[PDB]
Amino acid sequence: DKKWLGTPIEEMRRMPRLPLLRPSANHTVTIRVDLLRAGEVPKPFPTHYKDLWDNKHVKMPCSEQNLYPVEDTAGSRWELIQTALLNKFTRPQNLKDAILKYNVAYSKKWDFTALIDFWDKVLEEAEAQHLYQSILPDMVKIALCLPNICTQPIPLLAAAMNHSITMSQEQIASLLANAFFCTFPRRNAKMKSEYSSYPDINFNRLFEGRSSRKPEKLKTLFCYFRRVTAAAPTGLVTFTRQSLEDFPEWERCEKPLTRLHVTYEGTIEENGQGMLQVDFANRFVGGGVTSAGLVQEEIRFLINPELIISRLFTEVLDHNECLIITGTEQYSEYTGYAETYRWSRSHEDGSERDDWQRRCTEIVAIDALHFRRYLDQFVPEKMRRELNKAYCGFLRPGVSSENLSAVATGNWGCGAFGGDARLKALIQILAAAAAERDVVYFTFGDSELMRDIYSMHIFLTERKLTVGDVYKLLLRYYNEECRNCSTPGPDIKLYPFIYHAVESC
Ligand SMILES: Cn1c(=O)c2cc(S(O)(O)NC3(C)CC3)ccc2n(Cc2ccccc2)c1=O
């Protein structure tokens, strides 16, 4: 009853040399490299706050251009924020009233039910006592410190750009304390066109309704804010936007298949340590992390909070793009999934740091397609799309095959998205092969799926079929079993078709 199949996970390339970290035309470094030292909290670069208020950068809450209308007169919104947050919250309403002081237009649109219910109905007296007395004051302190922490203008990783932003974990915490307190200007109204192609950053939507899940999301987030406020994080984090111009001619790809480890046990974060961990992403990175959504992406964004900050500068992902986040830390341990997600305990991430003091953790955000009808996923353009999506996230332009760790993946785009597990598994296997990387596949309790993926991989490997040879079989399946197939389910399935087409040849 073998719990895993293929190449042993111990033989799979696990990570971690690095070229000198320096700013460049396509790389933003917001800290002092010369002073970057292990165990030492990074010093921000520049020394004095530098402001930018343009269509190309983040509009900081502390900017001198961040103003609000007054009865005449244009007051400073950052002064309002300070005056608002420097009061003693001793009841949930105190915090609601503080957020709404500098967010007037939303005083009747923003619901604070989940925030009230967590403080008054979920938390115990002593727990709530630790909230209004210790965590929250300490959160306000790191938020208000923003001009001293984030001195350099942060660029927006806009669509088409191949750019990276290396910044300290301390800088990310000051930034996320501002998102909790809903301080980022020009990211609130659903009718603006300035940030409509960007995901929600301010945490307002986390405070609405009566979902049993929001207290759990809040417990997760407060565990993070408690950690970072208690002890300043010492490491760094890199956010790369990778856009590809030239994609492979799939039908004529001579590359063979790589190695595979396939299991119905384990997780991406635990068993995929030192591997390229795949995030089953939403085109707007992080999905509904700051609202109702609570699946694969949201859970990760909750357990690894420095992922939430990508939402501040990552423009909606177009088909040829992916987001690579390196150096994020895990602050929480969890139980369950979706409607049964529970915050377990505090986790102490024991990962090593690289020459750029980044935790040896690499995550790729790759968005899958949302199939309107189930048969649409076998349509050539749509299989070519997913293959280009995965290839992008897997490809490392300018890196040697031997120095690339395995891909830790699973059922990507399968739930409310409708993806065929068996097709997606082949697309990922073909993407990884084209980008010379082995595959570590988690089937999440599905024992059957694991046997099926293993068998297909072994069948293709032995009969020695190329990426082109396999891709041509997927084009045959659409033609023979989908092109004029009216019924919602085709007569014959994909893997039986693959065994048939090859054996009979
Ligand atoms: C669809 N689906 C997943 O995609 C899944 C993915 C992960 S993970 O990507 O390893 N880890 C996380 C959520 C990134 C941090 C962990 C649990 C998962 N589960 C729950 C489950 C696991 C085992 C048996 C029964 C249910 C699930 O249903």
Determine if residue 413 is labeled as part of a ligand binding site. Answer: yes
* Residues contacting residue 240 through CB under 8 Å, at least 6 positions apart: 163, 164, 323, 324, 325, 326
Provide the 8-state DSSP code for 378: G
Q: Residue 33: what residue type?
A: V
The annotation status of 31 as a binding-site residue, yes or no, is no
Map residue 371 onto helix, strand or coil. coil
- Ligand 1 contact via 442 beta carbon (within 6 Å): yes
C-alpha span between 258 and 429 (Å, rounded): 8
The helix (H) or strand (E) run that includes residue 29 is strand 27-29
d(CA 221, CA 251): 46
Nearest atom in ligand 1 to the alpha carbon of residue 415 is: 1
DSSP label of 491: S
Q: What six digits make up the tokens of 307?
A: 């992922």
The answer to whether the CB of 60 falls within 8 A of the CB of 51 is yes
Look at ligand 1, atom 2, and give the residue with the nearest C-alpha. Answer: 444
What is the domain count for the chain?
1
List the catalytic residue out of 170, 298, 354, 438: 298
480 is catalytic: no
Contact status, residue 174 vs residue 309, Cβ threshold 8 Å: no
How far apart CA 494 and CA 455 sit, in angstroms, is: 13
Longest dimension (CA), the chain: 85
Kindly calculate the radius of gyration of the chain based on its CA atoms and give it in whole angstroms: 24
> Distance between CA 388 and CA 466 in Å, rounded?
17
Q: Measured between alpha carbons, how far apart are the two ends of the chain, in Å?
A: 33
Using alpha carbons, select from 417, 368, 370, 365 the residue that is nearest to residue 394. Answer: 365
Q: At what angle do helices 296-303 and 214-230 cross, to 10 degrees?
A: 30
* Sequence-separated (6 or more) residues with CB below 8 Å from residue 397: none
Residue 328 identity (one-letter amino acid): T
Both structure tokens of 414: 């399968």
Task: List, in sequence order, every residue forming a beta bridge with 278; answer none if it has no partner.
Answer: 364
Looking up tokens 């003091």 gives: 357
**How far is residue 207 CA from its own chain's centroid?**
21
| Nearest atom in ligand 1 to 337's CA | 20
DSSP 154: P
Tell me the CA–centroid distance for residue 338 and ligand 1, in Å: 9
SS3 assignment, position 323: strand
273 known ligand binder: no
Going by the DSSP 8-state scheme, the letter that residue 61 receives in this structure is T
What single DSSP character describes residue 413? T
**DSSP annotation of 59:** -
Q: How far apart are CA 407 and CA 45, in angstroms?
A: 34
In 3-state terms, what secondary structure has residue 425? helix
Cβ contact 275:408 at 8 Å = yes
Q: Residue 149: which residues within 8 A CB-CB, separation 6 or more? A: 44, 142, 170, 171, 174
Cβ 312 vs Cβ 300: under 8 Å: no
CB of 397 within 6 A of ligand 1: the answer is: no
- Ligand 1 pocket test: which of 302, 328, 444, 448 has the largest number of ligand atoms within 8 Å of its C-beta? 444
352 annotated active-site: no
Task: Enumerate residues 6+ apart whose C-beta is below 8 A from 453.
Answer: 260, 262, 422, 425, 429, 441, 443
Residue 253, annotated ligand binder? Answer: no
What is the rounded CA–CA span in Å between residue 133 and residue 128?
A: 8
**Structure tokens given for 315:** 């423009």
Q: Cβ neighbours of residue 140 under 8 Å, at least 6 residues apart?
A: 85, 86, 177, 181
- Token readout for 499 is 């065994």
Yes or no: say if 322 and 312 are a contact pair by the CB < 8 Å rule: no
Three-class secondary structure assignment of 334-359: EECCHHHCEEEEECCCCCCECCCCEE
Element (H, E) at 462: helix 447-462
Structure-token pair, residue 266 = 């384990």
Structural resolution in Å: 2.9
| Solved using | X-ray
Closest residue by CA, ligand 1 atom 10: 267
Q: Taking Cα atoms as reference points, which of 393, 352, 100 lies closest to residue 235?
A: 352
Which of 246-251's residues contact partners 24+ apart within 8 Å by CB, and which partners? 247/320, 247/388, 247/391, 248/391, 248/434, 248/467, 250/384, 250/387, 250/430, 250/467, 250/468, 250/471, 251/468, 251/471, 251/472, 251/475
Q: Is 279 a known active-site residue?
A: yes
Give the C-alpha separation, 389 to 383, whole Å: 10
Structure tokens at 79: 């002064």
Q: What is the span of the domain harbouring residue 174?
A: 1-505
**CA–centroid distance for 453 within its chain:** 26
Q: Are 297 and 310 in contact (CB under 8 A)?
A: no
Instruction: Annotate 390-410 with b (16+ C-beta within 10 A) or e (fewer).
Output: bbbbbbbeeeeeeebbbbbbb
User: Of 236, 237, 242, 240, which Cα lies nearest the Cα of 164?
Assistant: 240
Strands of 285-404, DSSP E? 321-326, 332-335, 342-346, 362-367
Query: How many other CB atoms are there within 10 angstroms of residue 328's CB atom?
Result: 30
CA angle (433 as vertex; 408, 492 as ends), nearest 5: 90
Query: Can you spell out the DSSP letters for 397-422?
Result: TT--GGG-PPEEEE-TT-SSS---HH
Tell me the C-alpha distance between 46 and 269, whole Å: 35
Task: Answer whether 446's CB lies under 8 Å from 422's CB.
Answer: no
Rounded to the nearest angstrom, the distance between the alpha carbon of 126 and the centre of ligand 1 is 33
